[PDB]
Amino acid sequence: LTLGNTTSSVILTNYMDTQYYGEIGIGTPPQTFKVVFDTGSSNVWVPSSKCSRLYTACVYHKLFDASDSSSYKHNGTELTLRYSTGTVSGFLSQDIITVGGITVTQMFGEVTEMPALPFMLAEFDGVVGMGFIEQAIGRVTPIFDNIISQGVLKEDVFSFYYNRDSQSLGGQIVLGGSDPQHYEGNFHYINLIKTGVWQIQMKGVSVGSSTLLCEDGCLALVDTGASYISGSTSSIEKLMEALGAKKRLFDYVVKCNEGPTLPDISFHLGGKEYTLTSADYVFQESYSSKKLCTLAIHAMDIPPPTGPTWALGATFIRKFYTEFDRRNNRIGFALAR
Numbered sequence: 001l002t003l004g005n006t007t008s009s010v011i012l013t014n015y016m017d018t019q020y021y022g023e024i025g026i027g028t029p030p031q032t033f034k035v036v037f038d039t040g041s042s043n044v045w046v047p048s049s050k051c052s053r054l055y056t057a058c059v060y061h062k063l064f065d066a067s068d069s070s071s072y073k074h075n076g077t078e079l080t081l082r083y084s085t086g087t088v089s090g091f092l093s094q095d096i097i098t099v100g101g102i103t104v105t106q107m108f109g110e111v112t113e114m115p116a117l118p119f120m121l122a123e124f125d126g127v128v129g130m131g132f133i134e135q136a137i138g139r140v141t142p143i144f145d146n147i148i149s150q151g152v153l154k155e156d157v158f159s160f161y162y163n164r165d166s167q168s169l170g171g172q173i174v175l176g177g178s179d180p181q182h183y184e185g186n187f188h189y190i191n192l193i194k195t196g197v198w199q200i201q202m203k204g205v206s207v208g209s210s211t212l213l214c215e216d217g218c219l220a221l222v223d224t225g226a227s228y229i230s231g232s233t234s235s236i237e238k239l240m241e242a243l244g245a246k247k248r249l250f251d252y253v254v255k256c257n258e259g260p261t262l263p264d265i266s267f268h269l270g271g272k273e274y275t276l277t278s279a280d281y282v283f284q285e286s287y288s289s290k291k292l293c294t295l296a297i298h299a300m301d302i303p304p305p306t307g308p309t310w311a312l313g314a315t316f317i318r319k320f321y322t323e324f325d326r327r328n329n330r331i332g333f334a335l336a337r
């Protein structure tokens, strides 16, 4: 493990508080893509020019054209990424990828099958997984592992800052460090339950005074690629019940007036109590009683080995700056400023 003296940031754009993405270039000359950085997976993919135009999602995103890249190297083995809320499919390819000014040779998936629901709902074109090789499909090396192999980063860590807001910085990732301009107080760490997955032990979840949730203990996925906080269907039904929340098709709501009356939600992680006020988790876009406001906390059942498990996504990261320590297998939380 070589540690140099470089640091890179990626500027992130915030879309509707649910999608955070920046820019990467692929090939010679670079073909730019908007991608999301997902600690909850470990592959890289962008949609491919070879994606049937009968896939509307492809007609609406940037497509990588190998035949315009003088650095592309063929491989072609099949690939399928089955995420919690949708699937993509295609084949492996190799080329140069610029990310934060760092240039790295990388194997990625050229997706030739991307469903309208949901990809038609995506602002970005692709994903850059920030997880370990233990979660990478097709045994493909992760892009951070590859960057780490170059020995240029100060520390074997990267940090996420998601702003709430929308002219202003949308978000920011620091490869090989953190940006103290974005957090305050001290960091506080937790060791990953295991290596291979950005997940940690969670002691309890309290809704207001009356602590409903996992009084015993549970798992928490720290997930930069997720818009919401998610828990087991079971856990979430009880959580929601105590908020007077009404469960609809894909989300929970409450009469827009009742939003601010909603109590605090805390999550106990290694000693500190991480609390979110209603303003932190409601989409207050009205104050009327005649209108339903949505909650940034979904119900989602994740299977073994990973699940069952809570997910802490953009709803949480927005309040607490997050550093992913690969060297020590821990995750620091600080108060985002």
Ligand SMILES: CC(C)CCNC(=O)[C@@H]1CNC[C@H](CN2CC(=O)N(c3ccccc3Cl)CC2(C)C)C1
Pocket (backbone or CB within 6 Å): 018, 019, 036, 038, 039, 040, 041, 042, 081, 082, 083, 084, 085, 086, 118, 119, 121, 122, 123, 127, 135, 137, 223, 224, 225, 226, 227
């Ligand atoms: C292969 C294996 C590791 C699966 C387990 N990992 C996972 O499911 C990932 C865990 N992090 C979250 C991630 C969210 N996905 C869900 C998804 O639909 N996106 C999405 C989000 C918002 C709008 C539109 C879209 Cl499309 C974003 C995105 C990133 C494609 C799935």
Ligand SMILES: *[C@@H]1O[C@H](CO)[C@@H](O)[C@H](O)[C@H]1NC(C)=O
Pocket (backbone or CB within 6 Å): 074, 075, 076, 077, 092
């Ligand atoms: C895809 O990469 C793997 C991993 O090294 C390799 O064995 C395989 O031969 C590649 N396929 C081709 C056709 O280049």
